[PDB]
């Protein structure tokens, strides 16, 4: 049936991927040993989407792990869920790109992406009907950006009509974990602006603010942010893996959410977000979730949606809910928030409802918006890239890798065209 291939870029891709497959293992009741302990048929019904049937009846998650620094994947294998993946899914080189996009992409990704592509073809042959691919990676990282870029390009080259989406970590505005980030982000975004169907933008800073503020935390680590992001990533796919009303396929969502070919960029959101002990003062209703979702503070992308307008909005619900409540809330919200939505796009909302709530909660929801706040993000990134590019900082590495300046120039031009196109519709 409908099946998805989950490709995990090195580093955060693999880590997030680990937590992601943990979440999925919890969803379908799959034991880390590979055995199915689940009590429901719905779990095994469409399970073939993310899993394969072994002769030993152990469920192999469908994924391909790729990194240039084996240590991470070693840490993954040492993990409890590393046993689920077959040893063939682990594909890596012994030399990291060192946050160099050109190096990885042009040099160190080619061999590995060839091997990975072979494995992809295998996994693709294993599919009855392939819906598409999903890539967990990071903008600004050498391996993720370079190898992800190349791999996605080749994946589209082989599979042009298939669904291409990626969950990408965007550069934080007020902080940075690395330098040179604008270059890598720019190049990656460029090739990803042309080569994908859609992409999701999530910033760790915004996640820190959100989690700390709403969940009342103290010492949160990357695992928690990855847990949340993975909850979202699992959240969007519920309609495919479970029955409900207005079941939304990924490409249908892509069609509904994308008004124009070049602007696919989305800002995810999630509800309910509440701290322990404060939940007792919270009532779970569609209005609550919708109010949490449409709140600017809960946007996981770093920006303020108050500046811009929504071209398209998709809201997917989980658990048993009333259509009337949803409709009324969408209308009311769209009514009071008028002028925050495009005037030439009547009914900006896209609704889908899954009957199965996330484990531990009676109900939940996920928000996916499209707005020019991302144009603001691109303005920032463009500015930083310009500033760094002017004085030719760190350029010697990329030129060392044989990266021509005209590539950077063209990329910048494309970014300018992107933000321009965002300004064109507003």
């Amino acid at each position: 049936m409908r099946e998805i291939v989950h490709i995990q870029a090195g580093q955060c891709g693999n880590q997030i991927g680990a937590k992601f497959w943990e979440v999925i293992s919890d969803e379908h009741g799959i034991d880390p040993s590979g055995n199915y302990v689940g009590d429901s048929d719905l779990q095994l019904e469409r399970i073939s989407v993310y899993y394969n049937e072994a002769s030993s009846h152990k469920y192999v998650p469908r994924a391909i792990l790729v990194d240039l620094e084996p240590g991470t994947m070693d840490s993954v294998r040492s993990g409890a869920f590393g046993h689920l993946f077959r040893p063939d899914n682990f594909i890596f080189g012994q030399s990291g790109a060192g946050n160099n996009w050109a190096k990885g992409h042009y040099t160190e990704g080619a061999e590995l992406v060839d091997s990975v592509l072979d494995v992809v073809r295998k996994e693709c042959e294993n599919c009855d009907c392939l819906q598409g691919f999903q890539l967990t990676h990071s903008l600004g990282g050498g391996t993720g950006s370079g190898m992800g870029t190349l791999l996605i390009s080749k994946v589209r080259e082989e599979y042009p009509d298939r669904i291409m989406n990626t969950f990408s970590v965007v550069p934080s505005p007020k902080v940075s974990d690395t330098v040179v980030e604008p270059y890598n982000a720019t190049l990656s975004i460029h090739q990803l602006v042309e080569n994908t169907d859609e992409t999701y933008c999530i910033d760790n800073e915004a996640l820190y603010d959100i989690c700390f503020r709403t969940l009342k935390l103290a010492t949160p680590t990357y695992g928690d942010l990855n847990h949340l992001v993975s909850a979202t990533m699992s959240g969007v796919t519920t309609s495919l893996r479970f029955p409900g009303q207005l079941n939304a396929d990924l490409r249908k969502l892509a069609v509904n959410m994308v008004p124009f070919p070049r602007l696919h960029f989305f800002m995810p959101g999630f509800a309910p977000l509440t701290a322990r002990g404060s939940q007792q003062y919270r009532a779970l209703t569609v209005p609550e979730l919708t109010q949490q979702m449409f709140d600017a503070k809960n946007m996981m992308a770093a920006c303020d949606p108050r500046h811009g307008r929504y071209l398209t909005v998709a809201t997917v619900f989980r658990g048993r809910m009333s259509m009337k409540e949803v409709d009324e809330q969408m209308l009311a919200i769209q009514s009071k928030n008028s002028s925050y939505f495009v005037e030439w796009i009547p009914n900006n909302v896209k609704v889908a409802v899954c009957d199965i709530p996330p484990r531990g909660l009676k109900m939940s929801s996920t928000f996916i918006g499209n707005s020019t706040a991302i144009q603001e993000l691109f303005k920032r990134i463009s500015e930083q890239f310009t500033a760094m590019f002017r004085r030719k900082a760190f350029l010697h590495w990329y030129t060392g890798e044989g990266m021509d300046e005209m590539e950077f120039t063209e990329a910048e031009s494309n970014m300018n065209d992107l933000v321009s196109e965002y300004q064109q519709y507003q």
């Binding site: 049936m1 409908r2 048929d41 019904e45 009855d128 009907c129 819906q131 029955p243 009303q245 207005l246 079941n247 396929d249 490409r251 249908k252 892509a254 069609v255 509904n256 994308v258 008004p259 124009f260 070919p261 398209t312 809910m321 009333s322 259509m323 009337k324 409540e325 409709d327 009324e328 969408m330 209308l331 030439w344 796009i345 009547p346 009914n347 900006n348 909302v349 896209k350 609704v351």
Partner: protein
Amino acid sequence: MRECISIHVGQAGVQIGNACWELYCLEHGIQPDGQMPGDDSFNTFFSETGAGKHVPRAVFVDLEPTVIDEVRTGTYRQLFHPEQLITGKEDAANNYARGHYTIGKEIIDLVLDRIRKLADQCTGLQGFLVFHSFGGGTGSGFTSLLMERLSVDYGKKSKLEFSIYPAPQVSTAVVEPYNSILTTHTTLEHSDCAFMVDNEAIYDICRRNLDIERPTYTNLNRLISQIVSSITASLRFDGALNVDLTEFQTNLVPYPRIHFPLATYAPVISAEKAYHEQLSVAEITNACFEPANQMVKCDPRHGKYMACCLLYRGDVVPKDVNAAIATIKTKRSIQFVDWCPTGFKVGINYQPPTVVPGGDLAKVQRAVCMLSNTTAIAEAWARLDHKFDLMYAKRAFVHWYVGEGMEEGEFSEAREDMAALEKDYEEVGV
């Protein structure tokens, strides 16, 4: 003898179909296993095998397995013939292109052969029933294509369909206008009659009248199922006045290009109010002609009545019925077009409107199903046309359709047809 084939396309059609066939099974006392522990008008809707196992006559088509698989794992999996359930490996993605053109073309042939064999089993086959959502990709495209094909194949056979009408305010998708417009284009060029239903109006009706909790698609589908079952009940039992579908085609359609009867059902009341409520034919009709009780959000007072059909069930006396109709005619808030001496066609059936077990609707000894044509629906078509006009003016989402094999001139022509429809309604409205 007299028989009909019920087609179900899209999740809407399938679910509505499930509720519908359930209600049929209830009315005919048939169990999910096809066993039934005077009514041969059930053979009208059913066939029979060696063991006396009764099977429904229908074809379920969804390009994605989804709800049909849910039905295959459902209670009535023992009822429907496995061959009647046809599923593809992927959806139309709310894209008219795919369903009407790219995907469904590799499917529909099987469905046509299926319907053909089902039609070969028939003797006196009167017509068809097509359940689908209006603006939903699969339903829209596939029903357009299928209606074209069936229109060519079966000719004069009655073609009826129930289309879920996109609401003025609430919307489940952004691309609904495109699909709806293409749909009404290719569908108008073929379909004999189409019943429009607005979920928002159903919400209003149930919530305000039925006084229930904020509902889900279940009870809505049950209500629509009651309406459909009422019509078929007009056909499925011996009343004082029996009405063929051809008679609906005859009476409700003044012109070949205009068929859009609006359904309204009464009584709609809570189980509690039923005791304080006294249902008289006149009162039920009075309730029927109220604008708030319409299954569509279209306001009737912005137009005039061309054709009106009233189907009665259970205990009804035609005397007070015609008396009531006169009393209704005396009302000038309700106005009829000048060139129509009488827009009333009445029918009556002794079979009462049985209620679904676990149903929220009050049990009554009589009920009325109303079908009506007005130009306020043209106003509705106007607002839809406006939405489409804007969305198309900015060429939003068009690249999908185009890339999937559509054309700009196609949308243009559809728009032209819609304009023609508007002006037709306008001219007839005079």
